[PDB]
Design an enzyme around this catalytic site. Structure first.
Site, short mmCIF file in Angstrom:
data_model
loop_
_atom_site.label_atom_id
_atom_site.label_comp_id
_atom_site.label_asym_id
_atom_site.label_seq_id
_atom_site.Cartn_x
_atom_site.Cartn_y
_atom_site.Cartn_z
N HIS B 41 34.08 68.75 60.48
CA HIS B 41 35.25 70.52 61.57
C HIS B 41 35.92 70.17 62.39
O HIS B 41 37.07 70.34 62.86
CB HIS B 41 34.09 71.13 61.50
N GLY B 143 33.31 71.37 72.86
CA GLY B 143 33.64 69.46 72.70
C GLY B 143 32.37 69.46 73.23
O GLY B 143 32.64 68.20 73.10
N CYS B 145 30.78 68.81 70.02
CA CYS B 145 29.90 67.93 68.91
C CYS B 145 30.33 66.77 68.15
O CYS B 145 31.37 66.14 69.44
CB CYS B 145 30.94 69.36 67.93
O1 LIG Z 1 32.87 74.27 69.96
C1 LIG Z 1 31.76 74.53 69.76
N1 LIG Z 1 31.89 74.63 68.64
C2 LIG Z 1 31.97 75.10 66.98
C3 LIG Z 1 33.07 73.56 66.77
C4 LIG Z 1 33.97 73.36 65.85
C5 LIG Z 1 33.67 75.45 65.12
C6 LIG Z 1 33.66 76.23 64.87
C7 LIG Z 1 32.71 75.86 66.53
N2 LIG Z 1 30.76 75.80 65.39
C8 LIG Z 1 30.36 76.81 64.99
C9 LIG Z 1 29.31 77.72 65.85
C10 LIG Z 1 29.82 77.92 67.36
O2 LIG Z 1 29.34 76.92 68.12
N3 LIG Z 1 30.46 79.12 68.07
C11 LIG Z 1 30.43 78.81 69.46
C12 LIG Z 1 31.06 80.26 69.99
O3 LIG Z 1 31.92 80.73 69.31
C13 LIG Z 1 31.85 81.03 67.86
C14 LIG Z 1 31.09 80.12 67.55
C15 LIG Z 1 29.31 78.94 65.35
C16 LIG Z 1 29.02 79.14 63.81
BR1 LIG Z 1 27.91 80.33 63.18
C17 LIG Z 1 29.16 78.04 62.83
C18 LIG Z 1 30.13 77.09 63.92
N4 LIG Z 1 30.59 75.88 63.29
O4 LIG Z 1 30.81 76.48 61.52
O5 LIG Z 1 30.55 74.94 62.86
C19 LIG Z 1 30.46 74.64 71.06
C20 LIG Z 1 28.78 73.70 70.25
C21 LIG Z 1 27.92 74.65 71.48
O6 LIG Z 1 26.61 74.12 70.34
N5 LIG Z 1 28.63 75.22 72.17
C22 LIG Z 1 29.36 75.83 72.82
C23 LIG Z 1 29.19 76.62 73.18
C24 LIG Z 1 30.61 77.16 73.38
C25 LIG Z 1 32.09 77.14 72.87
C26 LIG Z 1 31.90 76.70 72.02
C27 LIG Z 1 30.66 75.58 71.60
#
Ligand SMILES: O=C(N[C@H]1CCCC[C@H]1Nc1c(C(=O)N2CCOCC2)cc(Br)cc1[N+](=O)[O-])c1cc(=O)[nH]c2ccccc12
Ligand SMILES: O=C(N[C@H]1CCCC[C@H]1Nc1c(C(=O)N2CCOCC2)cc(Br)cc1[N+](=O)[O-])c1cc(=O)[nH]c2ccccc12
Lengths: 302, 304
Positions: B41, B143, B145
């Site tokens: 992603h 950040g 991931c």
């Molecule tokens: O940057 C992070 N994630 C991003 C990375 C890029 C892709 C989207 C997102 N991943 C998700 C998420 C998700 O994490 N969020 C976070 C909150 O707002 C939106 C939903 C949920 C589903 Br459902 C599916 C996906 N996906 O498909 O990647 C992230 C990671 C972490 O561990 N904790 C955090 C705490 C706070 C903010 C962000 C994170």
């Protein structure tokens, strides 16, 4: 989201660990520039430990009585001396993996990471707090002496602890890297015991802010309280007094959550005299006090 | 003496972490030999995340759309391909700090250490368990991931987890280093939810053995149990059922303490029935399930 008991990355410290043998005793040494630091009790036999004269014992040793091993290479010792309860071994090679580092002495209530080592080899890393009675509730076996505690700021390792001993209750005692003991303990096999401990109140409040940041809010209440009115309740439950400086140190967390420090104290007071009523906070049934306000800010901000 | 939630020393993994950027998206990568691994992603904008076709998105990228940074050094990307949910960026330089390593897929209930990273720099290390519902209870922010989970066995780093996302309840989901998710989760921003979780029973028993090793016996009793009666009771507390493989895995701990496994199971049943009555066990007021039998033997034997 989430809140774990997180240790600093240990790579900068793994590069300094070595094995120090003297006679039948093997333990861990810290190799920085061309000096290896380790507990002075490495020079004692078990009979020596009952009543050691370290000055006299050290004079009987020459540089060849000390073997230092880093990996598969034996470091040649070219000088030895003591500073308080630490032995300093000068070696003919400077450690090329020596990081930027400082020796600092910490206060009770401050946290640090421990790299548990045996025969100069790392076994694991964990996060510790210095207890108000100057012990640490570590995890240490025979051969762990010389393991170090540390903090990291930017690229600089702040070594704050070197492990020396286990007390009868199974808690641990050591010195700073200048060899000064934390707490009223001595490197002698004699009757010693940890004092009565208390709970680090500023750290508990910081951890309650961490829980609110993570969505646990059931313990917030409508009440308020004065600092002196809280301090009188805390002292009955063996909690350290909350100072005005502690309140200032909680300012950043109160601003982030919008909850005044004294409003959080009002919640903590109710928790102390009522219990948690079968609930948990951040996955714990006990009030956790091994996170400082800075620790919470760091983990909840990167 | 003592018992702590202990992570593996992180040095061998610290030297593998890099920063991967594609467009305005940045995250962490794992640099081993001349390949950098990262969540696929990284090629998506936020608009792409509802229903991305990663094959279509990647075909529109070139090698020079990826900027990989290791410290102050930029690594030239010379190739790219997808394997399931991980992106593999070939670079022209092999990582001189590559440890001996393996890619493994772990089972529910097993533990590993997490090196939490941001912008390619490690900021902390902690110990995690793969929950039965295939999430981990981590500590991760925007950040993070591409941070990895790992074990060490002998000289070799066993990578088992790469971080991809946070679920609405605040728990976390990711993949093995093959890019296959643990659990039924996908790297889409679509409605996903952790199923109901259970307690890892074999880990609780191993931890009770650690308590005995550390000199505590107050929770033992004179009873024993059959394995099937133990499971009938334990499952009413939402504990995972105990199998005969689990019983054999507790053998070494049982042999060291002289307490038979089914006798420790009897103690667990009473603990569930009574609680701790104001006591603690190894510093905890709850029954801990994030230590495996191998973790217990390791911390109680000084494995390095
Ligand atoms: O940057 C992070 N994630 C991003 C990375 C890029 C892709 C989207 C997102 N991943 C998700 C998420 C998700 O994490 N969020 C976070 C909150 O707002 C939106 C939903 C949920 C589903 Br459902 C599916 C996906 N996906 O498909 O990647 C992230 C990671 C972490 O561990 N904790 C955090 C705490 C706070 C903010 C962000 C994170
Ligand atoms: O190797 C360890 N200790 C050694 C190191 C040098 C020789 C003295 C001894 N330190 C002590 C101790 C002590 O540790 N013990 C442990 C039980 O047996 C004897 C008393 C007590 C007092 Br009082 C004073 C000292 N001293 O002055 O050094 C040691 C360390 C650890 O953290 N945990 C362990 C678990 C099991 C076995 C050993 C240890």
């Amino acid at each position: 989201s989430g809140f774990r008991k997180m240790a600093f990355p240990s790579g900068k410290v793994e590069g300094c660990m070595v094995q120090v043998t003297c006679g039948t005793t093997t333990l861990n040494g810290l190799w920085l520039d061309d000096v290896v630091y380790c507990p002075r009790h490495v020079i004692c036999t078990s009979e020596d430990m009952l009543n050691p004269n370290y000055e006299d014992l050290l004079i009987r040793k020459s540089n060849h009585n000390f073997l230092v091993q880093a990996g598969n290479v034996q470091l040649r010792v070219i000088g030895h001396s003591m500073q308080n309860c630490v032995l300093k071994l000068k070696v003919d090679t400077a450690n090329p993996k020596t990081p930027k580092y400082k020796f600092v002495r910490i206060q009770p209530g401050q946290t640090f990471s421990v790299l548990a080592c045996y025969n100069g080899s790392p076994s694991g890393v964990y996060q510790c707090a210095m207890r108000p009675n100057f012990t640490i509730k570590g995890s240490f076996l025979n051969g762990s002496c010389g393991s170090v505690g540390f903090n990291i700021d930017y690229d600089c390792v702040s070594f704050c602890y070197m492990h020396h001993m286990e007390l009868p209750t199974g808690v641990h005692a050591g010195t700073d890297l200048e060899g000064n003991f934390y707490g009223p303990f001595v490197d002698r096999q004699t009757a010693q015991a940890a004092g009565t401990d208390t709970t680090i109140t500023v750290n508990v409040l910081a951890w309650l802010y961490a829980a609110v940041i993570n969505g646990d809010r059931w313990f917030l209440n409508r009440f308020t309280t004065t600092l002196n009115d809280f301090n009188l309740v805390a002292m009955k439950y063996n909690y350290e007094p909350l100072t005005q400086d502690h309140v200032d140190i909680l300012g950043p967390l109160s601003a982030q959550t919008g909850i005044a420090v004294l409003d959080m104290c009002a919640s903590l007071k109710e928790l102390l005299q009522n219990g948690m009523n079968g609930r948990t906070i951040l996955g714990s049934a006990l009030l956790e006090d091994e996170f400082t306000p800075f620790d919470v800010v760091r983990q909840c901000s990167g």
